[PDB]
Design a protein around this ligand. Structure first.
Ligand SMILES: O=C(O)CNC(=O)c1ncccc1O
Ligand SMILES: [Fe+3]
Length: 199
């Protein structure tokens, strides 16, 4: 899509370390399946690291310094996360990107992410950096309207997408995860999305 940059296998050499750091983050702020304000439990399990974390609070979504499950700050952003995000963001031409939030998604087979926009960040000029690890997933994206036609791209282990420019506000999602196996993740896919969430 216009504005979006795909860097295939950009995070391949870093994957092992990133996965260790995911485990470390989740040991402090555990993965949970958040409940939408619609009352549905998501198939995707989530957690956050960094100064701010995306979560549900009082039947709604927000960036918060505190993990509502633990009542403690989200774990600090791992070095591996920060390094890889910056190498990706710079390669795609976003030198001033300074992320302070990393949402971590975990997909078991069957798990999917419904069509949505990321429009909750203060500056929409800032991109989102997205890192795929483990099992491959079909990423779908449309446009500015919920009913716009979808295009599909397979995202694989180590792929990084820098989601900026025109595509920044496009609706997008993930199709039900095909069952499979990966040496590093076992039977799941992880996705990291780095954001400038602070005002
Ligand atoms: O790949 C996922 O599991 C979900 N990714 C996203 O929701 C996303 N959002 C904004 C920009 C890039 C993304 O990959
Ligand atoms: Fe998204």
């Amino acid at each position: 899509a216009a504005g979006a940059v795909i860097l295939r296998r950009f995070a391949f050499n870093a994957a092992e370390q990133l996965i260790r750091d995911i485990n470390d983050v989740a040991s402090q702020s555990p993965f949970r399946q958040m409940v939408t304000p619609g009352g549905y439990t998501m198939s995707v399990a989530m957690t956050n690291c960094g100064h701010l974390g995306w979560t549900t609070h009082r039947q709604g979504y927000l960036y918060s310094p505190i993990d509502p499950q633990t009542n403690k700050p989200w774990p600090a952003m791992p070095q591996s996360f920060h390094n890889l995000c910056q190498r990706a963001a710079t390669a795609a031409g976003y030198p001033d990107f300074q992320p302070d939030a990393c949402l971590i998604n975990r997909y078991a087979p069957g798990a999917k992410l419904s069509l949505h926009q990321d429009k909750d960040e203060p500056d929409l000029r800032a991109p989102i950096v997205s890192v795929s690890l483990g099992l491959p997933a079909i990423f779908q994206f449309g446009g500015l309207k919920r009913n716009d036609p979808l295009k599909r791209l397979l995202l694989e282990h180590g792929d990084v997408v820098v989601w900026g420019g025109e595509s920044r506000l496009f609706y997008h999602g993930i199709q039900p995860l095909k069952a499979g196996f990966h040496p590093l993740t076992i039977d799941c896919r992880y996705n990291l999305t780095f954001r400038q969430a602070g005002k």
